[PDB]
Structures are given as C-alpha cells and as structure tokens.
Amino acid sequence: EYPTVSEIPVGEVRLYQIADGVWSHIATQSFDGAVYPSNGLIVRDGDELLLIDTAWGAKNTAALLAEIEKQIGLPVTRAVSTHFHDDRVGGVDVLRAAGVATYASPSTRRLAEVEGNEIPTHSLEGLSSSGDAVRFGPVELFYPGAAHSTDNLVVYVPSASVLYGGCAIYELSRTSAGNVADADLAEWPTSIERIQQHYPEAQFVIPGHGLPGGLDLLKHTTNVVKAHTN
C-alpha cells in the first residue's frame, strides 16, 4: 500500500495519505548505480500547504508541485528543508520561482552555501541549540542535535502524531549506515534519544528513505549507527 520504487518510475512523484491533512511525498531517486525511494512531507495548514523537503532537484521538484496541484489542489505557500544536502534543498529554486516561501535554519543555509547547493530564502531562528523546538504552522520543528548532519531537523505533526525524521532516521530495511560523510556518529545516538524523549507519543515515524513505521525506527537507527561506529 505504501508506494515503493515499484509503483513510482524515475522522475515521478506519488503522495501518500498518512492521516487527515497529512501526507508524505515519495520520489524515486537514482544514485551511484542504485534506485531507491525518498520521502518528504506535506501538511495542510488551514487552506494552504506546508511542504517539508524537495524531491531532489528541479525536475523532480517540479513534478512534486504538479502532483500536489492535481491530487490536493491547495497552494504550497511555505517549504522547509530538513538539512543542507542536495537531495533536500535541490529544487528550492524551483519552489521559489513558483511562489513558495522556502525556509531553513541559519545553520542549514550556511552549510548549503558552503556546499554550493541551493539556499532556502527564509531563516528559521531558535533551533541552534540541541533540544530546541519551535512551532511552525501545523507542525513543530525540532533540532535533536547532530546526527546524519550537524544541522538536521525532524518534523512532528501534533494533530496526527506523525514524526518525519529525514535522513536522521533509517527504515527497517536498511541494515548498514548510508552516507555518513557529514554525520556526527558520536552524537547521533544521543540526538535520537532526545527525539525519543520529546515525542514519546509519536504513532507514525517516517524515515528519510523507505517504509514508515513506529517509534522503533529510532532504536533501529540507533542499532545501525552503533554497529557502524564499531
């Protein structure tokens, strides 16, 4: 039932209704020989839509907007990128040209700039310290500390108890660590624990890539990060 790379051909995007006014957007990516699904989030904010992360790149993101415009019909007015990597900010220029107001922490914007990636226009203050949380429309933005990246943020939708971890949280099918070049392996577990202590009520946990699950994805991720560290 949850879209997999089997139901989504490269360059296309599919939306999945997780709860009322809450969706995940799935896009198939092709990287270094393999193909895999990438998850994003969409949260109804009144009569508008809040988008969490791009679909990696201009084309895919443009396809994302198109799939939203026809399946949902509400205007995407704001967007938040969970970290500076190209798969999460790539497509921001497209979002900006469509009238979407793009956001990201100063930390993320700084890192994207240094990396030469697209840069969300607006800045999200109040998230520079581990454990920081701020309300942003229908969701709560949370910085658990360095993990997959030193700037990664996780998103929680209180009304639906949906937690989007971005690449900070792995799916069960992932047995080994992914790209940990810019990750803080030493802090990742402690950051996961902060996520656990802040959202003990989460019912649906969405990993950066793959099938959603429950809060056990946190421990899974921790198990995988631990093993990699050793």
Paired strand residues for 34: 31
Catalytic residue among 39, 53, 60, 85: 85
Shortest Cβ 13–Zn ion spacing (Å): 19
60 among known catalytic residues = no
45 among known catalytic residues = no
* 78 near Zn ion, rule: CB under 5 A: no
- 12 annotated binding-site participant: yes
The pattern of x and - marking residues 136 through 165 that bind Zn ion according to CB under 5 A reads ------------------------------
| Token pair listed for 39 | 């998850």
- Annotate the chain with three-state secondary structure: CCCCCCCCCCCCEEEEEEECCEEEEEEEEEECCEEEEEEEEEEEECCEEEEECCCCCHHHHHHHHHHHHHHCCCCEEEEECCCCCHHHHCCHHHHHHCCCEEEECHHHHHHHHHHCCCCCCEECCCCCCCCCEEEECCEEEECCCCCCCCCCCEEEECCCCEEEEECCCCCCCCCCCCCCCCCCCCCHHHHHHHHHHHCCCCCEEEECECCCECCHHHHHHHHHHHHHHC
Compare residues 19 and 101 and give the one whose CB is closer to Zn ion: 101
Number of residues that bind Zn ion (CB under 5 A): 3
152 among known catalytic residues = no
Residues 6+ apart with CB under 8 A from 111: 83, 84, 149, 150, 151
Compare residues 134 and 180 and give the one whose CB is closer to Zn ion: 180
Only segment of 17-25, 44-52, 96-104, 132-140 that touches Zn ion (CB under 5 A): 96-104
198 among known catalytic residues = no
* 101 near Zn ion, rule: CB under 5 A: yes
Shortest Cβ 152–Zn ion spacing (Å): 8
| Token pair listed for 190 | 């402690």
85 among known catalytic residues = yes
Shortest Cβ 161–Zn ion spacing (Å): 25
Q: Which of 44, 85, 194, 209 binds Zn ion (CB under 5 A)?
A: 85
Determine the Cα–Cα distance for residues 59 and 94; give it in Å rounded to an integer.
Answer: 9
Compare residues 14 and 85 and give the one whose CB is closer to Zn ion: 85
* 167 near Zn ion, rule: CB under 5 A: yes
- 171 annotated binding-site participant: yes
The residues that are catalytic are 83, 85, 87, 148, 179
**Residues binding Zn ion (CB under 5 A):** 85, 101, 167
Binding-site residues sit at 12, 47, 83, 85, 87, 122, 138, 148, 167, 171, 209, 220
